[PDB]
């Protein structure tokens, strides 16, 4: 499980309520204007 | 993964602060 830590982790994100929330919301408007 | 977690000391201070 520690070997495939990355793979096992990746699966969790797919069902992470807060991660998905912050992922969608925050990236919806990356600040960037000179 | 390239160390996505902090050493204890950084966490220790920030928690000690509570606005």
């Amino acid at each position: 499980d520690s070997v495939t830590d990355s793979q096992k982790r990746r699966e969790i994100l797919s069902r992470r309520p807060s991660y998905r929330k912050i992922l969608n919301d925050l990236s919806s408007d990356a600040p960037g204007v000179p | 993964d390239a160390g996505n977690i902090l050493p204890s000391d950084i966490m220790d201070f920030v928690l000690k602060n509570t606005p």
Partner: protein, 87 residues
């Protein structure tokens, strides 16, 4: 068509916002004395170094955000578990 414009459409300004928010993530509001404190500089140093690893390893914009997003959640959990005692 597509050579090496990857880092051309990504500005330092964009990254600067990312690093600033990276700090905010750990310390939302530091007081005037905290800001000028060594601990704060070390905190920024973490954000600066992590920013470096991300850009180098990202290779793609989507991954760039993805790496940071997971990383912030990891800290967030750690902070929360810590707060359990420090009530």
């Amino acid at each position: 068509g597509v050579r090496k414009g990857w880092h051309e459409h990504v500005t330092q300004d964009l990254r600067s916002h990312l690093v600033h928010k990276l700090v905010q993530a750990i310390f939302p509001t530091p007081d005037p004395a905290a800001l000028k404190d060594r601990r704060m500089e070390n905190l920024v140093a973490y954000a600066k170094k992590v920013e470096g690893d991300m850009y180098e390893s990202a290779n793609s914009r989507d991954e760039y955000y993805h790496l940071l997003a997971e990383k912030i959640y990891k800290i967030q959990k750690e902070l929360e578990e810590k707060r359990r005692s420090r009530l």
